[PDB]
Homo-oligomer: A and B are copies of this chain.
């Protein structure tokens, strides 16, 4: 639909016929190629072979030769300043 705003004023872009429930994982707003806002509750995970622990550690459920390599962890504070950036060379014994 079409919504009207006026200069100097603010406005809320209402998600039509929709209500926020505990069954919603992500709400994403974009304007063209631009990401305006996005909310996501559960963490991103590549697959079920991985998982992130409460302390921030990466759990790799079942190791295979292809899980070896350098893994980079980066932590940002609440105002998004990068307070940590480490590399862990994961070697797998065969």
Contacts and interface: CB of A to CB of B under 8 A. Distances in A.
A73 B11 contact: no
Interface in A1-56: 1-16, 18-20, 22-32, 34-46, 50-56
Contact of A63 (B6, B37, B91): B6
A37 B78 CA distance: 18
Contacts of A42: 78
Task: Please state the number of chain copies in the assembly.
Answer: 2
Interface size class of A (residues with CB under 8 A): 35 or more
Contact of A75 (B22, B24, B77, B79): B24
Contact of A58 (B12, B50, B55): B12
Contacts of A73: 13, 15, 27-29
B59 A38 contact: no
Contacts of A30: 71-72, 74
21 contacts: A1-B87, A3-B88, A4-B90, A4-B93, A5-B68, A6-B63, A11-B90, A12-B58, A13-B88, A15-B73, A15-B75, A19-B55, A20-B56, A26-B76, A28-B73, A31-B70, A32-B69, A35-B44, A36-B71, A37-B45, A39-B44
